[model samples]
Target chain A: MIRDIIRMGDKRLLRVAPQVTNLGSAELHALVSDMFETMGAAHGVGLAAPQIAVDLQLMVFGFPAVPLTALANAQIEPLSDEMENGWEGCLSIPGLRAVIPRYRYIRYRGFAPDGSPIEREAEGFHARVVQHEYDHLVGRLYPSRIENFDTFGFDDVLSYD
Target chain B: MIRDIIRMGDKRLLRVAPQVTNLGSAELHALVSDMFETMGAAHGVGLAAPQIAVDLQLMVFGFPAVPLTALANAQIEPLSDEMENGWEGCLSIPGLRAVIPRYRYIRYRGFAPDGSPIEREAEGFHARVVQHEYDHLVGRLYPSRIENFDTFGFDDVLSYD
Candidate 1:
């Protein structure tokens, strides 16, 4: 079933969630299904378990252009300090856009639903998407990373420079 | 100090968070202070405790155009079935905008951080703002309410219609 997402302002969205110890289990798989369904229903590319109020380190994302995958307890290792500024939006914090800086490239590792190791390298948009979803697990959202309010506002402000 | 917002994907962003049983306590008041700072740092008009990962029913909002208020254990009561659709965004979910429908008017009930009861009537933008922030306590983000994907997209799409 399509479930609700935890929006910003709920303090739970800010804490480090619990680890998903029940890997490869039926319950875990079921949750994965629900997350994917929820994300897709919302027309989102990714979703973390905490966004669903489950308080676990599970994320389901990658679509509209990437392999649909489920990763649990993911970790990110930035390969460079070259920060790239890009436009970003989140499902939880809808209807506004901001430019956020993320590592240009990174190596990420995480567990698959069956408890298998999954590792990959990503850069540019892919890296941004991964990192964006990962932030949810650690109690972070893009608005917190905004250093320039000039670049922050509702969607109505967009236009040609 | 500015704290991170809990974005979508973390399960905490999706839970019915704990209540502020500590109304009037120093801890709760301190949290209110931090929440306001955090929301201002992000250039937001409203913020909830779950957005900061605190898992309590507290919100700080109103700025640049409204009264600054701190609310704990808030609840929304729709006064009419009249639905108004408007542009919307969120701090936790940054960089995208969509049109969501909300009650045209509402009566909200909650507690002040000082443990006093707070009640008010709202309509249009004020009602929208209250309900938007209230969604966080129940683990909801704007995307879940998005029914028309045609109206959803990045911030770069705004222009003269």
Candidate 2:
């Protein structure tokens, strides 16, 4: 089921999502599937529970270069003080993109819907995608982290292939 | 003419290139065209005069999203103190890719092959590509700027779409 994605102005988009306690529950599995489908339908790299008005600490993301993954109660630790800026867009804030700074390398841990433990070291785009979703769990949008207003704009203004 | 790309161990790759003084010279136009062809043949996002064993401050770059451009005596100014890390590879280095930190936004200035002034502001992948090419003018390669050795490896080891 590709559920509706709540927009940025929605009150639910600002509220911190609750941690997933029953990682292996049937309900958790269904929510994970819906998150993936919703993200796919939106053609987004990642989506969080709050974006779908679920108010749960969950996210699904992947790109052609990155494999699809779902994280519940995800936590991230910066592996380096270094950071990188990259343009990002959200399904909840369609037509807009902003430059966001994120850790260059991170160690993230969480649980799969099956209740399996998941931990890994990530860098480059992988680290970026995880951090973006983690921010959603904490009630932060990409624009909230942007420092330069000049770099924020509708996607159509920027040239693409 | 597609000149041979100098490899990493080549002594010329470490030498700082000279600035281009006659940007509008017929020789400059020929060099720019050849560089663009060479970069296209090598299937790289950018190429510098140093990489092609020419000791001149010149480079050409473009992505499918960004059109091909030639820069003579190019200089870049950071638009923000913020930076971001992204994976990069070089035609000279061939099989390797490394995470490199670059300014999120940069204002770059230079001259077209015809000596016309060129200046623009760029962010995200566009900024990264310009900085990568600029490093070559100063005798720097992506490996020299990598903060984490763990993230450096053969491109085949890294997954891409």
Candidate 3:
């Protein structure tokens, strides 16, 4: 089920999401399923819980040719000062693009919907996708962390990442 | 020989230090040696050229029982959202302590005084110390990145890692 994405203007986008204490609850599993479907429908690399109006520290993300995955209460650790500066867009914001400097290497730890621990190290696009989705959980949009405003513009004018 | 530290009020502290184009020049080598000795004389973990009234993107830092080290034109990239929140004091600011959120794990790359490329990954206090020194090159201080005001105070009032 593809639920409506909460747009940028809503107060919910700025609110810090609460952690999901129940990992394997039916609600948790159901939301996870919907979020992955919603992300594919929206053609996004990932989506956070708050994007769909739920206030849980949960996010779903993936890369090319990979199956979708989800994380709850995800914890990220930057493994290097190395960065990947690339253009990014938010599904909630719509039609805007900004170049963001994101960690190119990271180790993340979190839980699956079934409560199993998931720990993984990522680099390149994988790292970018996780960090992007993680920012949404903490009430941060990509715009807030953009180092240069000149790198940001409307998608209609720029039309590229 | 110890040089005077350029304190917080100076406009130089706010200006980004320029890159050192002549990496192996006598002046660069001399400054590197002087910075290490000055940091030791002042009991600092690290110090930048800007902190010593020179506008070069160079810094020296060290940890417990280790020989001082220097990096020129250093680059830093955050690898994770995980951070270490600890009290930080600066030689340039004098008499202040701020609990800052710094990347605990990081990979830093820069040139050595003799123009050798130096690359290393660090964690914990080592990473924090390197980052503190790096911020000076870009005209950023610990206070500018403080997330909450309550965590900042004077050295006499509070302190810690």
Candidate 4:
């Protein structure tokens, strides 16, 4: 089930997604598998169902080389939204960067491959990634939440702008 | 150039990747494109070249659902390793969740889409995601640097044991 990689400027990329009601559907499973492949093949740490253009709330994340862990269908519950600004770049948006604010900690709930409900409290950088990626599941982009866009931009900004 | 999805338990999912020396190769370009597709479709925040099992030091990231910006390349430099813990999940290991620690901030020197040198700093969650994914590019995973895996995995042990 290889799928389309939604790019920046794709209208569907901006549409908020619906909650996943059928996790056991063949299409869902196949999409998940394909996402895993696409993520790995592309050398990514995580790939979400939405990223592949499948408007469902599913994602795959793993660091295949040194520390090995893979997660699917992750649900993050925010523990704290303490603000922290970070520079970010996107695959959809090329040649620009931004300073986006994110939560300093989070409480998340998700399932395990064996269908077990997994929950944990996260803080610092990991918490931020979970929240940022989780926002994508709901069709949120960091720039939309950014307060100061001028602080970050394309590489040329530092040189000429 | 759509490709197969990589899955958990695949031996390749556990191996570290080699540094990418040829970003101009068709294979690498195609891989990057597919990575964008996979990452965007999956609605992820950032991705590395290894999670897809490519084993290269290249990766992509952004606020999914936003205009593409900051298309970075190998020339990007990393700023710092000040880190924090956050909730994280993986597509490869679907459903599993963790509280992994990562750098709180970092700066990178990379090339832009037009082949310009780009210098930038990432802090908070974005920094964590990039660092975590980049770690994968070099064959590293979150668990390797997790500060308290038991706190994150205790419930799992209790449930499974």
Q: Identify the leading candidate in terms of TM-score.
A: 1
Model 4 C-alpha lDDT per residue in residues A17-39, reported as the tens digit of each score:
77666555675556667877887
lDDT, candidate 2, B11-120, per-residue tens: 56666888899877888889999999999899989899998889998999996397789999899999999999888988876666767789999999989999899999
Which candidate ranks first by lDDT, i.e. highest?
Answer: 2
> What ranking emerges by TM-score with the best candidate at the front?
1, 2, 3, 4
What candidate 2 gets wrong by more than 4 Å, as runs, is: A1-161, B159-161
DockQ for model 4? 0.02
**Residue-by-residue lDDT tens digits, candidate 4, B1-161:** 43344543344544556655554566656677888788777766666655676666566776714234334444334456455767775554443445777667677666544445656676777666666666655544444454542332212322211
Off by more than 4 A, model 4 = A24-27, A64-74, A155-161, B1-161
**lDDT of each residue in B1-161, candidate 1, tens digit only:** 68888665455666687788988889877788889899988988889888888888888878726668898888899998999998888887676667789999999888999899999998888888889999888877786676654455455543312
Tens digit of per-residue lDDT, candidate 1, span A76-122:
99998999988888887765667789999999898999999999999
C-alpha positional error of residue B135 in candidate 1 after TM-score superposition, expressed in Å: 28
Residue B123, model 2, lDDT:
93
Which run of 10 residues does model 2 chain B get worst, by summed lDDT? Answer: B152-161
Error of 1 at A50 (Å): 0.8
Which DockQ values do the candidates obtain, in the order shown? 0.02, 0.02, 0.01, 0.02
Q: Select the stronger candidate by DockQ from 1 and 3.
A: 1
Ranking by lDDT: 2, 1, 3, 4
Q: Candidate 2: TM-score?
A: 0.50
